[PDB]
Design a protein around this ligand. Structure first.
Ligand SMILES: *[C@H](C[C@@H](N)CCC(=O)O)c1c(COP(=O)(O)O)cnc(C)c1O
Ligand SMILES: *[C@H](C[C@@H](N)CCC(=O)O)c1c(COP(=O)(O)O)cnc(C)c1O
Lengths: 396, 396
């Protein structure tokens, strides 16, 4: 049965990491990383998370299964983060949340739910996006179409091209939006652009699917949800796939949520029953440890305060590296405009370098970016910035 | 998009539990439970697990993502449990293991892998089985057909009927076997029956899929794997979906494994690359906490010894309740043969009562079994056995 199976395409993540490990040069620098790193080049466990884990160790008395949709407090805290305390969506009980194994698990649960219970056949994804978006939706039997997004000339949002692209989307298609910190570009709509998109989505009959993996990494928790909330104010229906991997540094514990919104409580409860069926037939019920940490933190004034400051620390270090990168490139004689790096939000940006320049950076200088261009600015430090920028100037 | 969605069928688990909670009678008794309970009616965290969790809290320095297939030590320990230390399957590197979110996650990863990368269209499942088997395989687009298993007259394995049923299976169909402690009957093949089935499977060209959720609950870790190992000795290819939910009491941490076996290392590695693709497009990578606990325990002599004794304690309490149940029914005047309960293995058995007797037990006596018949003998205690058995005799 297995003798003729075609191998999957080589894992480019595995992968780039393997090449970097094998590189016997210093100072080699890895900007192809997929997680936050601090100024020491580590991805520590957050202190708020360690404190929560100690509390769980002391107080847990069973590992009995969670419900299919997970910890109720986790759901409530998630909806407040998404929509705001006192939101009409919450007051009117229009939203149901399932705790999922990561943001990815939430995307797949959303996809399976839509494929099996609606007429949805197609999901529109930005060009570019996280490569796993297409894999997730295709796995559920859904077609993926791309819409224009990145202006490679100006390093900005090509808003006219975006709108023109999405004119080809039919009523009943899904359109995927990154809530904040677009991956890989770091280019987000302005609030007014979000409002324009919200109105257009209503007029054209799109179902919005928000991927919200970086709440708190652009400007702040509430500000980063402005776009989502502009959509929520305008739509009867939407889905949010959110992740706590990055903003709690809980990557490997698989902590995310799929939030379903419908016109009223009866409708969302009925629809959610089928979302729970899609979960049951996948991984049955979700992993408790990571989500319990998140619920424990978000529902406690003291732990939440520590966590919010740790997240602010990450956000600020990322912005400091963006600024230091631009300043240092100028000082090392790049002699061209990289100011777009300061405007972009989150860990990831396109550098504006070509695929051949990226290859040259790897081969000749031991500087590693994702082949297709994504650089993680959290791989930058004050200590490695000068050689990093000297290498970049050398391939310009 | 959601206004016309048909509700999922009412959750019978949720469900029965809700009815039991609302029941204001004592002594109400819940035998419809889906987990182990000790003599106090609790499902504690195992001491070995608590000790491991303390070690992890003290020594973990990152939550950085695991690989798609999870913790390597977890995989190695899993293969030794399945196949035996020094197995040719292990020596010849014919097996690859992915850590998954529970046994259910392993079943779904197996199903998605088969649906997308092989000609498999059909999975044969015992009548009866765990109801979620059909849901999982159907979710991946696979047909489920039933094979005869339970002899309702003699409360035994209807082996002739089983063989006759499976004659309708075509070469290239998957056949699902429960490794030990068949759910819901507790009826397992003898070693000689397993050997007969192994030979037949080779001759007919079936792909064996083992669901191995109860290793250690029938006779012991090695004895409970005899059946699987008889198949492994005879087949080039098979898949094992195993769970640590029950034998580590780690239900809500979602700890299982999907083990792929092929004729040689090149073939299993190639095939496994597509199993990893199926995982990536589902939940990306697996939850660390539960699996790290399992790897920590299995790879440490001291913790493993404590865990093995805790599992022995569970196995023995289950067997003691099976014996006490049969003895007490006789003493309360049942006046019919329940000796099959002693022969059956694990938490679950059919009582031999009808669906109407089960309903009557719930309504008139506050004794709760799964409507279709499954009783969990770990819901029995010395303290509740007499009233339990008095109620049963009253509906005979
Ligand atoms: C996270 C991007 C990560 N995953 C980069 C490493 C990798 O690709 O493996 C991300 C997710 C996934 O979040 P979870 O880890 O919680 O599943 C989903 N959407 C976006 C836009 C991301 O950036
Ligand atoms: C476990 C049976 C449990 N799940 C009964 C409660 C319920 O149905 O929800 C079981 C599994 C699932 O194991 P995981 O919890 O690790 O996913 C798989 N196969 C069999 C035969 C089981 O009994």
């Amino acid at each position: 049965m297995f003798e003729n199976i075609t191998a999957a395409p080589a894992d480019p993540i595995l992968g780039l990491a393997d090449l970097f490990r094998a590189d016997e040069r210093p100072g080699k620098i890895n900007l192809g990383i997929g997680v936050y790193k601090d100024e020491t080049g580590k991805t520590p466990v957050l202190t708020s998370v360690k404190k929560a884990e100690q509390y769980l160790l002391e107080n847990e008395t069973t590992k009995n299964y969670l419900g299919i949709d997970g910890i109720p407090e986790f759901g409530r805290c998630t909806q407040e983060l998404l929509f705001g305390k006192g939101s009409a969506l919450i007051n009117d009980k229009r939203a149901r949340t399932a705790q999922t194994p990561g943001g990815t698990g939430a995307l797949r649960v959303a996809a399976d739910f839509l494929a099996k219970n609606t007429s949805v056949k197609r999901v529109w994804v930005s060009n570019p996006s996280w490569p796993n978006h297409k894999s997730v939706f295709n796995s559920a039997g859904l077609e993926v179409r791309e819409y224009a997004y990145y202006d490679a000339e100006n390093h900005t949002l090509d808003f006219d091209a975006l709108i023109n692209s999405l004119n080809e989307a039919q009523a009943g298609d899904v359109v995927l939006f990154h809530g904040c910190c677009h991956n890989p570009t770091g280019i987000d709509p302005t609030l007014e652009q979000w409002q324009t998109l919200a109105q257009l989505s209503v007029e054209k009959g799109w179902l919005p699917l928000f991927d919200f993996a970086y709440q708190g990494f652009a400007r702040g928790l509430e500000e980063d949800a402005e776009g989502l909330r502009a959509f929520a104010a305008m739509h009867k229906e939407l889905i949010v796939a959110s992740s706590y991997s990055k903003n709690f540094g809980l990557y490997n514990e698989r902590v995310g949520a799929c939030t379903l919104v419908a016109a009223d409580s009866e409708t969302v409860d009925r629809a959610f029953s089928q979302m729970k069926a899609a979960i049951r037939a996948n991984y049955s019920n979700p992993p408790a440890h990571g989500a319990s940490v998140v619920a424990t933190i978000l529902s406690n004034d003291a732990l939440r305060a520590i966590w919010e400051q740790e997240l602010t620390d990450m956000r600020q270090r990322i912005q400091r590296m963006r600024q230091l990168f631009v300043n240092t490139l100028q000082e090392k004689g790049a002699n061209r405009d990289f100011s777009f790096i300061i405007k972009q939000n989150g860990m990831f940006s396109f550098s504006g370098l070509t695929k051949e320049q990226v290859l040259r950076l790897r081969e000749e200088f031991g500087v590693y970016a994702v082949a297709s261009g994504r650089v993680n600015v959290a791989g930058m430090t004050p200590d490695n910035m000068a050689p990093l920028c000297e290498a970049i100037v050398a391939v310009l």
